[PDB]
Design a protein around this ligand. Structure first.
Ligand SMILES: Nc1nc2c(ncn2[C@@H]2O[C@H](COP(=O)(O)OP(=O)(O)O)[C@@H](O)[C@H]2O)c(=O)[nH]1
Ligand SMILES: [Mg+2]
Lengths: 151, 160
């Protein structure tokens, strides 16, 4: 296992990743399209889901069956860090699905999540994603530990 | 608008169309095809809203965009990402970052704001304007017929 694996999801995750490219192979990014992919990302892992080119209910059934495939690209590690926005459609779905998988690995990890504040859509998503993490904490019987950063 | 050439109006429309062509060119950071779809088809995910005729306002300043009344759905493009400000009270809001090497980038920031509480007035102005014009032309009073029941008129209206 590596010391730490860093996982980023959705646009916000992609954007934060650009600041951590010096960590290279330890960084793993996921999104549903390439709107946020920039040149510096060549230095890290980037995986885009298939058939997915803001609505979480729409994105979920498309990405769910692909999660096992995403997880195979994430090495076993002694610790993980997960990072995404609570308020969009892709990060707030990929992030928690991967988080659920990390719980199944009996992993130690923390997340960095952003409270998006632009619109009632963002705010509704923030609520549903926090509730998602709570449901996961209960279902997997594990604390889901997050550093919460409001915009 | 009275006094303005169709040439002038057409030029303005073409320049606005180009901004929309730019908007949807899929080359902006952070901006998805799905982001655009959910901006303009806002009732798809906001089911409590009423589908109806809405106006699109295309503005090149924050100030002008903020002055769109009762904004529903907003998309902002910025060339300088330092200038991004989450202004207004729309229900849906998204931002894209334009590229300085994008030759189609005509302005430093462009805001595409959709509302619907503006169409009313527009229609009123047209109805009121037409009414006034019709009133001036309506208030007419034709003269009495130049032919009396005395003239012998045949089926083709021939009087011989
Ligand atoms: N802190 C932060 N917030 C962002 C950033 N980009 C977008 N946001 C906010 O997060 C929301 C979700 O955007 P994004 O993460 O790109 O959505 P996703 O790709 O569907 O996961 C947006 O509506 C913004 O309010 C970013 O780079 N940093
Ligand atoms: Mg996105």
């Amino acid at each position: 296992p590596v010391k730490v694996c860093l996982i980023f999801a959705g646009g916000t995750g992609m954007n934060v990743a650009t600041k951590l490219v010096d960590l290279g192979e330890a960084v793993h990014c996921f999104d549903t399209c390439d709107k946020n992919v920039v040149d510096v990302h060549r230095s890290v892992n980037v995986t885009l889901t298939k058939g997915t080119r803001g609505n979480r209910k729409v994105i979920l059934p498309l990405v769910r069956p692909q999660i096992p495939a995403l997880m195979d690209t994430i090495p076993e590690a002694d610790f993980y860090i997960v990072c995404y926005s609570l308020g969009g459609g892709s990060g707030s779905v990929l992030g928690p699905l991967i988080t659920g998988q990390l719980a199944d690995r009996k992993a130690s990890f923390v997340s960095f999540v952003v409270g998006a504040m632009e619109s009632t859509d963002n705010l509704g998503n923030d609520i549903d994603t926090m509730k998602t993490l709570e449901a996961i904490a209960v279902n997997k019987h594990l604390p889901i530990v997050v550093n919460y950063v409001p915009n | 608008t009275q006094g303005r050439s169709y040439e002038s109006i057409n030029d303005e429309i073409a320049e606005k169309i180009r901004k929309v062509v730019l908007l949807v060119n899929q080359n902006h950071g952070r901006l998805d095809v799905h982001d655009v779809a959910n901006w303009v088809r806002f009732t798809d995910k906001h089911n409590y809203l009423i589908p109806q005729v809405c106006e699109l306002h295309i503005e090149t300043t924050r100030k002008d965009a903020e002055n769109v009344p009762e904004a529903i759905s907003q998309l902002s493009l910025y060339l300088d990402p330092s200038k991004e400000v989450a202004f207004g009270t729309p229900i849906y809001r998204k931002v894209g970052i334009m590229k300085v090497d994008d030759l189609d980038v005509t302005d430093d920031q462009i805001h595409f704001v959709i509302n619907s509480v503006g169409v009313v007035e527009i229609m009123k102005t047209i109805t009121d304007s037409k009414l006034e014009m019709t009133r001036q032309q309506s208030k007419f009073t034709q003269r009495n017929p130049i032919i009396d029941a005395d003239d012998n008129v045949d089926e083709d209206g021939m009087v011989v």
